[PDB]
Every structure is written in C-alpha cells, then in structure tokens.
Amino acid sequence: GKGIKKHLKRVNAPSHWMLNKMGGQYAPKTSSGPHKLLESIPLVILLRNRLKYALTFDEVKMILIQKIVKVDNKVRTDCTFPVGLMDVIHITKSNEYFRLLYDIKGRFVPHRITNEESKYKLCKVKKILLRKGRLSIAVTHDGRSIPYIHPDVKVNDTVRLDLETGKVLEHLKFQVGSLVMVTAGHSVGRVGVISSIDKNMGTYDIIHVKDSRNKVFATRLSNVFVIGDNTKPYISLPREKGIKLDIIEERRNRLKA
Amino acid sequence: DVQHERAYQKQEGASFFNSKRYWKKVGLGFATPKEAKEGVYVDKKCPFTGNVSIRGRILKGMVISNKMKRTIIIRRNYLHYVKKYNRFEKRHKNIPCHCSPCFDVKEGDIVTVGQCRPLSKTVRFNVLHVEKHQIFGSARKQFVLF
Amino acid sequence: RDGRHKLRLTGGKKKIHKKKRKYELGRPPSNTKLGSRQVHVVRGRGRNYKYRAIKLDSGSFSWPTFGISKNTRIIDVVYNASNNELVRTKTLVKNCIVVIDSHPFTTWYENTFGTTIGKSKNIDPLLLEQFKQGRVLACISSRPGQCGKADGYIIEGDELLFYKRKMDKRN
RNA sequence: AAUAGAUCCGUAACUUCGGGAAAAGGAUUGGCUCUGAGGACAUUAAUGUUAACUCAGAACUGAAACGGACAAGGGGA
RNA sequence: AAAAACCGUAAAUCCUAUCUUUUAAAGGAAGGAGAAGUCGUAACAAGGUUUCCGUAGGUGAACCUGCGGAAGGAUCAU
RNA sequence: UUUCAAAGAAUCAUUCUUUUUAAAAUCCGAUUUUGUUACUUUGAGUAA
RNA sequence: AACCUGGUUGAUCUUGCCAGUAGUCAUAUGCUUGUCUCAAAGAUUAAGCCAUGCAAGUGAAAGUAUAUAUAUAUAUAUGUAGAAACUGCGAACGGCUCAUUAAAACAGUUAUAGUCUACUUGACAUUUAUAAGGAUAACUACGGAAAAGCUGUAGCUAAUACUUGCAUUAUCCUUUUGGAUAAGUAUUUGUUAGAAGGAAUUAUAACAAAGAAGUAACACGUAAAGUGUGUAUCAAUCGAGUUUCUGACCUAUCAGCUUUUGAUGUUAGGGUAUUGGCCUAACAUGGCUAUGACGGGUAACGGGGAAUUAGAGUUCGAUUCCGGAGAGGGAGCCUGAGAAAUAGCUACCACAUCUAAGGAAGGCAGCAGGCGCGUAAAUUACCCAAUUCUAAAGAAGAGAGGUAGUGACAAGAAAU
C-alpha cells in the first residue's frame, strides 16, 4: 500500500537534531502534534541528547510514565510530543522550568526559567477566522485556537496568552521598532528591530532586519516571530543573547580562553 | 444575439432581479477593460466574468493560431544555456491558452497570460493583457526577446 | 480510470506502465428516473457517503422572481440541452427541463398577496397563462445522482422564451 | 459445394507508378416505435404556407435470425 | 440467496498481417591469410607506347582503344 | 551616433572617497520620481 | 605531479597509429598469507524454479470474565489475577528487487482562489432515566470427511459490537430587572447584503426550502473536582492526489504524424474528493513538426553521487538515503480513513504440491538454505541487550535491526 509513512532513517534525521550516524538505524517520527516535524523535536531527543537524564529509550519511557513532565502547565504522557517553537516545559520533581530557545548557530536549546516568567508564553497567531454569530478566532503557530480576541489584534501581531486560563492579556504589533526572531532562516537566531518591510505584489514579501552591530539582513515574511517591542526582549534570551557572532572573530574569542 | 448554441450561457452569480452583469477586479495589477465592463458577451470560462480566479504564475508570448473558437496557441521563445560550450542557445515550447471574447487577438501580437485551474485537456492558462505588435514574414519564424 | 491510456498532445501514443491505482476509481454511471422515491448510499472515498438517487418523484423548487421555494412533485420531462435520449427515456440530469404542478404555488400566492418582504413584483402574463393551464415548465438545477434529491428553479422571461421557441417555424 | 448483394474497416510482392485491387482478410444486414439533417413559397430581424425519399444515430423485440427465395467472384503461391 | 439480463471493466485461446533478433539452405559470387604453385610485362627511368582521370566498347590477366581533360611530366623558356 | 565632465579631503610622489550639471510631475528657494529584457551584484527558499 | 618512450627508413624530418604507463568505491582470476581496526558481499546471466524453518500481532488504573485460582471481616462484599472468546487498532509500516519505463518518472520550483486527510492536539453543539431492546461468540452435547487458517442443528449468555432514547439556548421594548420573541450543524438548491486576501460566488448575516450525523444509557481514580473510550464542526498536525514552469542516452538507412476506436477545442451533462475528453451527446476542424514530432534501439529505475581532474570535460550511478514500479504476467474485487494490497480474495494460462482419485491448498524479487545459470557471490547461527515500530502501549512481539559466523571486495596501523 501507500499509506502515511511511519519511519525516518537516521541519515534522514532533520537538520537540527544532531544525531550520530552509527548510533542505530532509525530516528523517531514525531506523532501529529501542535508543530511541524521539520521545525520541532521530540521530548525523547530533548531530554536525552541535551538534558542527559537517561541512557536508554526504555529508561526515558520509565521516566515519562510518572506524571512529572508538563507542557504549558498541563500534563503530557506520550513520548512523541514535539515541544514547538515557543513554549514552557515544567519538571516539578526538581521544581525547574525550561523554555525552548534557539541559538545563533541554528538549533534548539533549553533555557532555565524562573517560576514568575515561566507562566507566560508568547504565541504568534497564523490565521484569523470568523465563526457563526460574529465571533473572531485566531489560529496560532502553537496549534492553538484562541476565540474572542480583541479587534485590535491583527494577523501578524503576537499575543500574551496565559498558560492556565487560556486567555489573552495583551497584543504586540510589528513596527520598525519591534524585536523579531527568525524561525527557520539560514540566518536564524538573530535578534533585531527590523529596519523596514518590502511588500511584493502577489509573492513573498522581504523584510529587512537591523542588528545591534548595525548589520542588515533580509528575510521572508513567513518565518518571523514578534518577541517584543523597543523596550526589551520580554522573555529571557539564551546565553548568546541572539546576536550573531562573526566567524573569524568568533575563532578569536574561542582561542582567547 | 448573444446565445446561439443549443444551450444558454447563465453568467453564474450575476443576479437578475433584486440588486439595488458581473465583473471582477482580478487584482495582480491588471485593469478591467471598459470593453469587458460594458460588453454583452456571456461565458463560463472567461477570466473576467467566470468562476475562475487567476493564481499561480504569469507568462508572456506570441499568438500563432486564432482560428479556433475561444482558444489560442501561445509559444514561449527564450534562450537556453549549455554548460559545455558556454554559449546560450534557442529553445521553445508552445502552450494552448484560453482567450476571452473581450480581447481581439491577431497573429503576432504580444500577449500576457496567467495560470488558472485546469480548464481543458491541456489548456491551463488565460490571457490578461494584449498589445498590438505587427509582424513581417511568418509568425512561427519570428522570434522576440520575450 | 482517470489520467492515462490515451494519446498525447503532439499526436503520439505513450507507453503504458503504472497499473491502475484505485483512487482514480471512476464509478459506474447512475441513471435516475421518475417513479416512487428510492435512493441508495455509496461508500465514497474518505467514508463520505454519497446519495445516489435511482427513482425520484419530488423535491424542492424555487421562484427566483420572489426568491421562494415550495415542495412539490414533478410531472413530465420535456427538454434538455444534452442528448435527446435522456429526455426520451424520462430520466433526470443537472440542467434538464421538466413539468410541475401549479396548485401549491398558486395557494402560496393567494395566502401571501391575495388575488388569484419585497412584494408587488407584477409577475408576467406569459407565466400567468401557463399557471392558468396548471402544468408549468421548470429547470432542474441540482444533481439528483449526487444529492439523492431533486431541486430546480422555475423558468421566467427570455429564458423561457428561448426554451419554448425551441419547443414549439416549429414542429 | 463453397460467398456472391450493399455499407464500413483494412489491402501485400511487384510495377511500365498507370495498376495489381472487389487483392488477401474481416465486421454489419429483420420487424415495429423514434431522433436529426438535407427545399420552395410572403409579411414589416421576426411570424406563417408547403414537398421528396435519402442518409446518420437510437432504444425494444425474436428459438441469434434477417443480401431469409428470386438474383450473385472461389481464392492464393 | 442461488439464478437471469443489461450497458461496462476485461482475463484467456485462435486466426490474420506486420515488425524485431538468431539460424538452415543445393549453388553462385567476393575478400583475406597462408606456402619456394601456374601464366604473363602491367606499374616505378622517356619502364622501354609518358603517366593518370571521367566515360563507351573489347581482350585469358595484368590491360587496350575511341572522345574530352590534368601535370601529380619527360617542358617553368624566341 | 543620443551625458559629457568638472571640483574637494585620506596611504605613497599615485590611487581612493564625496558634491553638482538639463527639462517634466512632487513639495512653501529647498525638500525628489522620470522603459523592458539579456547581462551582472547582492540577498531570502536553500534536506540530509 | 599541467609529464613522456620503442616501432614505418640506407640514415633524417613529419602526418599518423600501434604499444608502452598509472589509476578504478571495477569485477573475475593465479600465486602467497606472521597481526590488529574496519566490512563490500547471488545487481550483471535466469523479475528462473523452490524442500524446509520462521518472517505481524496486540492485556500492570480503565470494554467485556461462573474456562479458571487465590487472599482478606464473617454463604455474604471486595479484591488480586486469568487462558478460550466478541470487539477496538495496526496489519496499507518495514524489508527486497529493478523487468517495464525516453517529457512518462525524477529533480528544482509553483498552484491547490480545484481536493481529501487515520492517530494526536486545541477550541467547542443543532429539531423508562434512582438508566432502554435483542443478537451471539467462547462453551456444553451429536457429528463428518484424507486433509486444510473446514464445518450443522440444540441450548444459552455479555459488553465501549448492534440498536431506540432522558430538556433547553439565543434575541427585543419600557431601559440590576418585568414582559414579548426566535429555535437545523454540515451538505444541497433559490434570492440579497457582505474581518481577510491581490482578486470571492471568501468568512459571515437574512429569507424560502430540504436534510444527514450527533450532543455521553460506556469504564477507572487526582487535587491535603480527574482520567480513560467514543461522538458534530473548525484549524493545525503526520500526508496523499492532481498540477504550472525548466532540464535528458543513440539514431533520418524513422519526414510527415494524430483524427471512424477522442485526435484538438466549445457547449451541456454523468462520474469522481475536487477539475478535466476521465467519460457521454451535439457542434467545430483542428493539434504536433529539421529548435528532429511521430517512430526504432538502449547488455537504460531517476537524483543528490562515484572514477578521474591543471581547468575545461568523459565515463559508472542496482546498490546505506529521497522518490517510482512490482511481487509469475496480464484482469478484477471486498473490507478498511488509507490497498486495485498479494505472508487479502477471485478468474486464465504456464508450473507445481497432497490426494483414500472423490477433492484440497500455492507463490522465497522477505531472513536462512536447495536446484538451474554462469567466472562470479556468506550461517537452514544468537538475540530484541542498542535504534525504532505496533497495540488494550513499562513487563509482549519485531529475520525491521544489533551481535556472532565465512570473508586477501576494498581501506588503515605495523613484526620478520
């Protein structure tokens, strides 16, 4: 037959997974989740090759059996949960919160997060639809549908959704003074203010982003993430702080130890 | 005067009785001709009157044979490069494109065409803009930069 | 059954491989006629059941002039732009012409406006005389072999002029 | 003795390129009930008056048979 | 439900013609190689009739003649 | 064959950067747009 | 590492080829083999035939339990468990091979404003109830044939299998609140208006109609109210199907092809999940072509790749992976979301097995091995310990796969 495929070869493991060539034959194909397979990783990989909590897949299963891992302040049990672009994952046995961030080098990395700021996740809505009786709903990259949004919120804005009540708090728009992340660009991991946009008739629209070192780059409109306005990046960025570090002077920094 | 087939062209969705013809702004940067907006033709597969909606890509070409009814043939001259000898070389492919009666087509004229949903066995395109280009010799032979 | 096994654009013939995959399908034809109401259900692709009507008697029908609909039953089939066999065999298709009763519509008119929303539309004498006869024309619009039921809109104006002129410089 | 009528499909070696050739070799063929096309004539684009049998298609039906007798090439190397 | 028809999908067998690939075949007619065989002087010199070409005819064979050419000739030249 | 050129700082004697010089819409003497394409520079989409 | 030498001759200079030379992740083969690491391995021809053994099932809070056993206070209530069984779900993944395939596939690059979409996740619904009806397995009892994934009557009983079926929400006037009012989700048809996209016959609202499938009659236990199973829609997800554009081996001793049997298009319809000559009827006479079509060959699966490089290039690409096709070779078909599936079925031929002769069942181009072919290719080993899959998802399977075995295919380190 020609049904939906159910395996991924180890060589065909996605780019940012960073899995060894000889360590077996197959990598897990994430079950249908809230985020795309090409841009999210399973919790098994996340806690194995980064957290290093266990040494075998079955040990990871035994960990997952206890209702200790939590996503968006609620319980999850299936070993194939892609964490997604932005979220919060909580572990109560150690009372530690992790939040998924990127690197200027193009990967996924967990970031230690305190309890107060661990209750806030930022979601970029992807679609705006109208339902029966004039109620407007927003569909997010998070695979989450938020009904009854403000008339203020537009398509590309980002929304301060609370984890527990499942309700909006505030909106953040996309002026030339709004901090935006790049999701899957070849220059992924750069934090900038965006100098301006460039809308093209019936095609992709290219937006220019400016950095803290006056570097200017361009990116497709599809894969941007409103993270905060000119005041500050609202959430805690990783150690690299989202500024991309040039190769030669990066080698200089590495050499100078 | 407008229907002569063994049927009637309905002009779907145009309404007849309540209100206060139908035409669409198509978008893309092209304009609806006054001829199309004040004509009397009725069609189902017309880009500016029918249920189609232009999406996909945009091509440009020459007219070759307008003898059919409501269908014309478009060839796409261009240049193809060869990596071995490092010299460009000519290569072409034609493509059957539908035409709306609002546009007068003549052999050799430059026509712009847009992609539309499969409309016939191998006709998947609809003409949008036509400019008068005279010809000398044979339309088949004649080649242009477009 | 859909997409192979025929000549090409240029005029040649393509060699055949790729043994017929099921999703091409091409279900056998269904022919719906006039009689007692009886329908079947077909296991369409994706478990989407499809209603195949084999014998239809009644359904919905609409005045476009007043924008209304009333249930009734068809009487006879008299014309279709398609092949003459489908009208000589008393079957139903998407864009056929058939004959309907007038009594339900006349009763609605009497109960609403009197005399034998946006009222006061002045109607038309040509349809008035046909109503007086009591059996009228109507064009089906839905696909009976797809929806399992019939629906059409009564014909008015120059459309009926063209239909009737082809019907009956006339045989 | 074998068909042989008519329509349709297809038709080789050779050749003086004109033919061979109806090559060879096949398919259809009744009855009843219908559909379409093929003209002339007169009124201020439209409505009327009126005539052949000729083809193409369709269902239905019969003990699967229908150039039902009469009439009529056996082909090939 | 067996059973039956219908348009339809169409397996499989045979006939007919064509195409593609190997192979038989009495004899005929070529080429090559072989070995000191047989017949001649054809060609390389003015090769003992300058050579060669195109074409028609003839001879045992190399060849010859007729017609129109070329010098790659045996002449760069009263 | 259809816009040429001129002018100024910074290494060593040179190179290099920068300003304007027609007409037509845009702004109350200044604020600024004036073919297509091949081509070429850049970018983004770029599976492992 | 941007390389030349012997050979025409009495000797010489040339054009020119033969030969020398080195590589192959390119095979076979001859000799020889003191170590270790690492590991290609019945593609070449026979997608030829196969003995045999296996290769896909599924139960730890949670459908169903007098097959069945135990343990607690005293036949009372609970439990702990449970083969056989009905049902759910997968079995349509994987693995293997390359015969067909020459604008078909494949790759890059779109569109789907022309569709569908299992599991999961997130929002969330419309026209007897102190708990409703039968219909049956395992089993018990009589059998039968040689035999197999064989089966009759009798009795039964269940379930989250099958099937009937138990409020109420929203809106307007005086204006917290009194009154009045409306009651269909998809899907289909007819008539109007009309947050986004670039453009809607978009979202949606109103009216006239039809009308599915439901909204819990199902089981367990967490905060010092929860979960499981299952149900309507929307969206995403894991995808698939059509589809635009650009791109290829040799050959003209293949120059005109296609069009009664759809060729090209228009109109209308059937059909499909959507669109379309996909198909039907009518009408039109059209479409491709020395920029090499139609044809023929390919000891031709396509691609990123491999061999060689001064740089250009030429040659191999079955082969770790992506995509395509296939399971003897055509044809057909049920179930199922998803198969035209082959360790699912049906029919033909060619094979071939068992046969009490009446009749049954078959596909190793899956992991091993046999025959045949050829120069040519490894054990009928161990285990799911690593990866990852399936399900009622910790405790069970997994010839996917890892290890072991044979191994001078190649590669690297280094004694005598």
SS3 string, A126-182, reads EEEEEECCCEEEEEECCCCEEECCCCCCCCCCEEEEECCCCCEEEEECCCCCEEEEE
SS3 assignment, position B75:
strand
**Which secondary-structure segment (H or E) carries C108?**
helix C103-112
Answer yes or no: do B8 and C64 touch at CB < 8 A.
no
Which residues touch C73 (CB under 8 Å, ≥6 apart)? C57, C58, C100, C101
Deposited resolution, Å: 4.1
Distances (CA, A) of B27 to A178, B21, B23, B117: 31, 19, 12, 17
| Of B60, B65, B66, B71, nearest in space to B145 by CA | B60
List the structure tokens of A231.
């005041």
Any idea of the CA torsion for C6, C9, C14, C16, to the nearest 10 degrees? -40
Does C67 contact chain B (CB < 8 Å)?
A: yes
Q: How many residues does chain C have?
A: 171
| Of C79, C95, C96, nearest in space to C166 by CA | C79
| Of B27, B28, B57, B45, nearest in space to B102 by CA | B45
Contacting B residues, span 107-136, partner chain C, CB-CB under 8 Å: 121-122
| Of A194, A189, A179, A181, nearest in space to A239 by CA | A189
Which residues in chain B have Cβ-Cβ distances shorter than 8 Å to C159? 8
Q: How wide is the angle at C-alpha B59 spanned by C-alphas B57 and B61, nearest 5°?
A: 170
| CA quadruple A14, A18, A21, A27: dihedral sign | negative
Any idea of the CA torsion for C100, C101, C102, C108, to the nearest 10 degrees? -100
Closest-CA residue of B relative to A202 is: B28
Which residues touch B143 (CB under 8 Å, ≥6 apart)? B77, B90
Judge contact between A171 and A138, C-beta under 8 A.
Answer: no
Does B27 contact chain A (CB < 8 Å)?
A: yes
Tell me the pairing of strands B125-131 and C49-56. Answer: unpaired
Answer yes or no: do B7 and C64 touch at CB < 8 A.
no
Q: Residue B67 region, left (φ>0) first, then alpha (ψ -120 to 50), else beta?
A: alpha
Which residues in chain B have Cβ-Cβ distances shorter than 8 Å to A202? 27-28
Question: What are the backbone dihedrals phi and psi of residue C58, each rounded to the nearest 5 degrees, phi first?
Answer: -155, 165
A37 touches strand F (CB under 7 A): no
B82 touches strand F (CB under 7 A): no
Identify the burial level of A102 via C-beta atoms within 10 angstroms of its C-beta, where 0-12 means exposed, 13-18 middle and 19 or more buried: buried
A9 touches strand F (CB under 7 A): no
**Experiment used for this model:** cryo-EM
Which residues in chain A have Cβ-Cβ distances shorter than 8 Å to B29? 201
Q: Report the protein residue whose CA lies nearest the C1' of nucleotide G185.
A: A132
Closest nucleotide (C1' vs CA) to B77 is: G291
Rounded Cα distance, C70 and C152, in Å: 11
**Strands of the sheet with A120-131, listed across from one edge:** A145-147, A135-140, A120-131, A158-162, A168-172
Judge contact between C127 and C160, C-beta under 8 A.
Answer: yes
Rounded Cα distance, A97 and C73, in Å: 69
Does A201 contact chain B (CB < 8 Å)?
A: yes
Closest nucleotide (C1' vs CA) to C20 is: G340
Judge contact between B126 and B47, C-beta under 8 A.
Answer: yes
Between CA C83 and C1' G293 the distance (Å) reads: 37
Answer yes or no: do B6 and C81 touch at CB < 8 A.
yes
Answer yes or no: do B17 and C159 touch at CB < 8 A.
no
Neighbours, chain A (3 or more CB pairs < 8 A): B
Between CA C11 and C1' D10 the distance (Å) reads: 22
Rounded Cα distance, A83 and A102, in Å: 13
Closest-CA residue of C relative to B96 is: C9
**Amino acid letter at A220?**
R
B106 touches strand G (CB under 7 A): no
CATH code of the region B1-146: 2.40.50.1000
Judge contact between C60 and C100, C-beta under 8 A.
Answer: no
Closest residue to B17, CB basis, from C9, C65, C81: C65
Rounded Cα distance, B45 and B101, in Å: 11
List the structure tokens of C139.
């064009």
Domains in chain A, start-ordered, CATH in brackets?
A: 1-116 (3.10.290.10), 121-171 (2.40.50.740), 174-244 (2.30.30.30)
Closest residue to C64, CB basis, from B8, B17, B122: B17
Which residues in chain A have Cβ-Cβ distances shorter than 8 Å to B28? 201-202
Question: What are the backbone dihedrals phi and psi of residue C148, each rounded to the nearest 5 degrees, phi first?
Answer: 70, 5
Rounded Cα distance, C142 and C150, in Å: 6
Distances (CA, A) of B41 to A52, B21, B44, B97: 72, 10, 10, 19
A58 a known binding residue?
yes
Judge contact between C140 and C53, C-beta under 8 A.
Answer: no
Which residues touch A175 (CB under 8 Å, ≥6 apart)? A229
Does C64 contact chain B (CB < 8 Å)?
A: yes
Question: In this structure, which long-range contacts are made by residues A44-47, counting pairs with CB atoms below 8 Å and at least 24 apart in sequence?
Answer: A44/A79, A44/A80, A45/A17, A45/A19, A46/A83, A46/A108, A46/A110
Identify the burial level of A97 via C-beta atoms within 10 angstroms of its C-beta, where 0-12 means exposed, 13-18 middle and 19 or more buried: buried
A13 touches strand F (CB under 7 A): yes
Considering only residues 100-139 of protein chain A, which place a Cβ less than 7 A from any atom of strand G?
126-134, 136-137, 139
- Which residue's entry shows tokens 């309540």? B18
Rounded Cα distance, A30 and A33, in Å: 8
Answer yes or no: do B8 and C67 touch at CB < 8 A.
no
Between CA A22 and C1' G41 the distance (Å) reads: 20
